[PDB]
């Protein structure tokens, strides 16, 4: 079992925090909030570094470029913005969604950004021009998550319509659709590190690990509370192989990936833990909570 213990609490956002993400080079933690701001913090000591602003409404997601120099954010103002972290400047504003932009991510090459919106589409944007390359009629309800696989050739998207679909990046055509015996809202999805599996959250208090090639569920994780918010889930790989997720009972849950047994529950936040992230090299977890809390916590484990 790991032994995560709270090391720092980061305060500064004025409304609920929406997401937290460690930079690939591991020196920074970035946070997005409904306060329309993005904040950068030192990953190991929680040191407040800077505030990046410009969006006109709340932000639901922020993601790093592979070289840790850029960020892309998704906002209710219907745009995504690409930022240069060092200067804090907005390099491009991506316009084209007709409603809130919910999720975003850079491909490994970092030449593309994929986005998901309440407008039910998935868009692929050219980073250098800031122009939309493709618009995919991906789903029939809001799009909760979008993520590229390891070589960037695939994109996985999820939606409240209960589906998780995999798309061919170059053509934008759908390669496969995954559906359980039922279709509760799919609130989050992402490929595993090697791109072979897909971790999916559904609003019935359940996380599932799917085999992409076989389209079958390999593991199911339960015990937490998740029926209302789109809560992120992560693969923790620096030490023991865990599955990490926030929960509506204000705790961070950690499961053993293979056994599916819960190995630790982190107590401390005073509101729904909406987002968690795992450090790329150290056994460190960042967690963020909603309105009654609005803080970010950094936890560290020996294993």
């Amino acid at each position: 079992k790991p032994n995560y213990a709270l090391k720092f609490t980061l305060a500064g956002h004025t409304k609920a925090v929406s997401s937290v993400k460690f930079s690939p080079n591991g020196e920074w933690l970035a946070s997005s909030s409904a306060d329309k701001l993005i904040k950068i913090w030192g990953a190991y000591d929680g040191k407040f570094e800077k505030t990046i602003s410009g969006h006109k409404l709340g932000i639901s997601d922020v993601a790093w470029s592979s070289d840790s120099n850029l960020l892309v954010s998704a906002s209710d103002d219907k745009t995504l913005k690409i930022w240069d972290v060092s200067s804090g400047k907005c390099l491009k504003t991506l316009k084209g969604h007709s409603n809130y932009v919910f999720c975003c991510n850079f491909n490994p090459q970092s030449n593309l950004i994929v986005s998901g919106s309440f407008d039910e589409s998935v868009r692929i944007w050219d980073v250098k021009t800031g122009k939309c390359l493709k618009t995919l009629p991906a789903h029939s309800d809001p799009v909760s998550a979008v993520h590229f696989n390891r070589d960037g050739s695939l994109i996985v998207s999820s939606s409240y319509d209960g589906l998780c679909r995999i798309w061919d990046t170059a053509s934008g055509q759908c390669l496969k659709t995954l559906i359980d015996d039922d279709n509760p809202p799919v609130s989050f999805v992402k490929f595993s590190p090697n791109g072979k599996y897909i971790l999916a959250a559904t609003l019935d208090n359940t996380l599932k690990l799917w085999d992409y090639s076989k389209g079958k569920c390999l593991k199911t994780y339960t015990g937490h509370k998740n029926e209302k918010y789109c809560i992120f889930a992560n693969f923790s790989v620096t030490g023991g192989k865990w599955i990490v997720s926030g929960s509506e009972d204000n705790l961070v849950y950690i499961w053993n990936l293979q056994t599916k047994e819960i190995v630790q529950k982190l107590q401390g936040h005073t509101d729904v833990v909406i987002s968690t992230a795992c450090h790329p090299t150290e056994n460190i977890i960042a967690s963020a909570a909603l309105e009654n809390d609005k803080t970010i916590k950094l936890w560290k484990s020996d294993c």
């Binding site: 925090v17 409904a34 997601d61 209710d76 809001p142 209302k228 309105e291």
Partner: peptide, 6 residues
């Protein structure tokens, strides 16, 4: 945003 229930 993600911070509100939809």
């Amino acid at each position: 945003a993600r911070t509100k229930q939809t």
